Amino acid sequence: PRYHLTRQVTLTDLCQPNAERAGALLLALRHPTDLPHLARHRAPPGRQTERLAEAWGQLLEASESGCARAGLVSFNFLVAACAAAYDARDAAEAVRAHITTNYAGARLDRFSECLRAMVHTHVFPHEVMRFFGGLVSWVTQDELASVTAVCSGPQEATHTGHPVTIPACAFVDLDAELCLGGPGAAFLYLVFTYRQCRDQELCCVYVVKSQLPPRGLEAALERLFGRLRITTCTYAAFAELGVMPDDSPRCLHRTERVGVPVVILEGVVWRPGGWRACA
Amino acid sequence: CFEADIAIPSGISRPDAAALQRCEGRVVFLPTIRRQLALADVAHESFVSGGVSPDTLGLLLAYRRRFPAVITRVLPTRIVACPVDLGLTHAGTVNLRNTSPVDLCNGDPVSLVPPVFEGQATDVRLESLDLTLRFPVPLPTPLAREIVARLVARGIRDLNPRTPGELPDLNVLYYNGARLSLVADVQQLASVNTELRSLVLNMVYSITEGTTLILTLIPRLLALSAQDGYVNALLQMQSVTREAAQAPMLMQDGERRLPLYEALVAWLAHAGQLGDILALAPAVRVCTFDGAAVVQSGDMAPVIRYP
Amino acid sequence: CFEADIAIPSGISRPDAAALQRCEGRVVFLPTIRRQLALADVAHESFVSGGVSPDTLGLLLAYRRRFPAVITRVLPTRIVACPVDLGLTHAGTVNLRNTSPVDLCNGDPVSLVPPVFEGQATDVRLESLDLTLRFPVPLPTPLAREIVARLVARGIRDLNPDPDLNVLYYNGARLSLVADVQQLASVNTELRSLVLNMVYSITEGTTLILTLIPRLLALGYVNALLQMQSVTREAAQLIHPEAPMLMRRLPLYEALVAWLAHAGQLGDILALAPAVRVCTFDGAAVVQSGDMAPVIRYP
Amino acid sequence: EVASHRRLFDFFAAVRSDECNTLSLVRFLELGLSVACVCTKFPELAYMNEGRVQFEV
Amino acid sequence: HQPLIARDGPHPVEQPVHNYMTKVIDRRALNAAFSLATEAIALLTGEALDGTGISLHRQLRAIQQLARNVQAVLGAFERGTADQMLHVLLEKAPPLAL
């Protein structure tokens, strides 16, 4: 009812929202203790399915689940772990200087191996680490966590807009699509662009910028790419991060919390959307 | 609603102000999200591209990259439109006008189709503001998916001639009775070609490795034909399935991948999505509060969200 | 919200009254949205479409057709349900009853057929007025799309016989799909019509495309770009399938619409779109079978 | 007119109302010449569409 | 308390069953509703007024909208009262040829 609260109790083995900002684009970790099984399934047999059986098992080594399940993944944890992967180096790598000095690359180094191992056996990182929200409160303990980081529509950026102002956490991120500029409202999405066996199972996390519908986004997902050179398949999944109902309030900064480039985005209808991955 | 207005820009033909009154509940394709916008991008002259007007398959592609909007209230100064793509958050269920020869149902998903009918052109003309208006025809979605397959395949017959001139017209439609004839006047090629390619390229990926085992059971299909009712009615007479009847190819690597289960996945990925990648997305659903089971031609039906 | 009332009919027993006490928080389907309704619009006997009992196809036609309603508070002489499909997005928190998987903190659960699980579980019958309330199963979007394609794949090996498809691990648990002793023999006769639908839409199109594309490209931007992204994929499928199978334009393009007409049916039939969301507050983020969950309105 | 005018303006927000040192004070008003340069006034425009004044010389 | 015509002869004795039979009350809805526009919400409460009589005059034309509507729904029950009696008589009416 244009104001909501959500809560999930996890560890600070992940994000450590005390080390994060007030505004962070948190993911969950849905199906957290999953993927020894789907490592074996869903892949053609030339992928040697005994890789992710150890790969996530080295992740929680860096992080026993207990009663506080592994979850609440930060926005930082994918950018810096793919910083060595995608086509931005020493600028996306400034996100690694943000994490390891505030959060830890010990958990990144196990997970950057997962980002070459999850995508290896066709266990693609979309529909795992589902969207949760914008880190409203951080009522966490010392080594444990209790975060309210509301999902559920536009109210996350009104109740942090009548007061976290939604950073993009990298100037390389918030992909400035539509340089063909005009007035309107912004429509935000979460795309994982892949490269399968060309760049050896590439991982990518960035947000697009468009005044485009979901039907005007799929052909926009076929155009503007140079990573078509694959053949397996089902690359470039995306869901709706929702509407920023203003293109006027975007910004360009390098000040956060290590000087990391960052984009202020004030006022967002967080339509949670749905994923799609077929081609 | 997240209110969006379109003003009356310049002058009025005095009966044509009443023509804007009887368009309450229709749909405007405005290619933006504005707090105010001129009426110039509204009409079909904006639908016309550089030099050339779209065909009824190009208008599908023209209605692709624009935004539908519902006429809510009609002022002599403005027209308040509600942005369907975002502002469908209406427990008041903002109302639409059915301009269609089909009496629908209760509970139909409703998708929008350009005017292609033989007698429901929806042509209203403004001469003070020199503009032409084609309103889309809201229709039920299986009947909508029965139309778009006809018009592309009619343009598939625009590539190759070969056959004698007596072709099956693709111009007789069937809803419980109700013989419908549509318009076949012009078929622009690029609207056919780009629609044909995605019909090709999606049907490429919808075949996989474990898909091939299913092809063995094609003679198994006709074994059910002469021994039941359901199968024999399922098997169409104008089908290639009755024509193709007149094998593992071992290559077995590993055999723990579930090859038959993986076949139905990627087939559904692309051949399962063939109505919506060719046509417009349905977001309008029939929902009347009074318990009325159908909605008459010309009525004001209440409209709820995405199906 | 806009709470809608379903009228309790005449004389029921106390176990029929207690049957109404074991359903507080289930999912109910209804044809129209009249503010007063009766129980005659609710029962499984109200799902007859051709004079016989519906199958899992005949339910999933209606399960995508009519409207979900969730009973908040049970009553004598009435049934209060605050329906899902009315109201603005992410408002009007409602409460569900879990069935054997988790329903995690997210997942966007989907109503679907009973006989994909135990058939005479959740087929709760009223004894006095003699009607049957077969409540749908609320499964979340990944596993709901998973199990729907497995039994119809298991229907193939049950169709014309000569691995085992039924293990299907969850994140933690091992989900026993097979309820062997009396259900699986009823499975392959209650998904009976449905397997023919997944087959005939494959046998038609693949045997149509292999006489479409050779009839195309020479009858040119779509020509060379046909196998451009399909190099050694479609020509390899032309090498594999067209050899170990058999090989007309005016019936062909007549069959073009008809298959793709059946294709547009199945997309509305299959894939089980999300209707309601779990995104709770101050919970343990993990729901168990038989426990309530705060469930919010729109995906 | 004038006193009848704002008397409902105060009431409109009134029914919408249910819906270590001092010198923190400055004062202000502006009238008198605020009518002189204006050099005519019709108050109370109602729901109106067109205003015609015709000249005969 | 049904009568007895208690008999002569050795046919056995009559027996007064002064039984209590019960019945069952039904439950009915009888629902009615009426609209109210997007304006006249600030009006009829006291939000959108002014010192203009026009503000008072269109405040009149909401009152003369409700004053016809309140009698319409309060009428609709008395109209609806008779319509139930035509249902509950015809529900217990057998056809008189039988």
From Swiss-Prot, chain E:
Subcellular location: Virion; Host nucleus
Highest taxon above the source species: Viruses
Purpose of the protein: Self-assembles to form an icosahedral capsid with a T=16 symmetry, about 200 nm in diameter, and consisting of 150 hexons and 12 pentons (total of 162 capsomers). Hexons form the edges and faces of the capsid and are each composed of six MCP molecules. In contrast, one penton is found at each of the 12 vertices. Eleven of the pentons are MCP pentamers, while the last vertex is occupied by the portal complex.
Self-association and partners: Homomultimer. Makes the hexons and eleven out of twelve pentons. Interacts with triplex proteins 1/TRX1 and 2/TRX2; adjacent capsomers are linked together in groups of three by triplexes, heterotrimeric complexes composed of one molecule of TRX1 and two molecules of TRX2. Interacts with scaffold protein; this interaction allows efficient MCP transport to the host nucleus. Interacts with capsid vertex component 2/CVC2. Interacts with the small capsomere-interacting protein/SCP.
Family that this chain belongs to: Belongs to the herpesviridae major capsid protein family.
Protein name per UniProt: Major capsid protein
Organism: Human herpesvirus 2 (strain HG52) (HHV-2)
Phylogenetic classification of the source organism: Viruses, Duplodnaviria, Heunggongvirae, Peploviricota, Herviviricetes
Gene: MCP
Residue span relative to the full protein: 100 to 197 of 1374
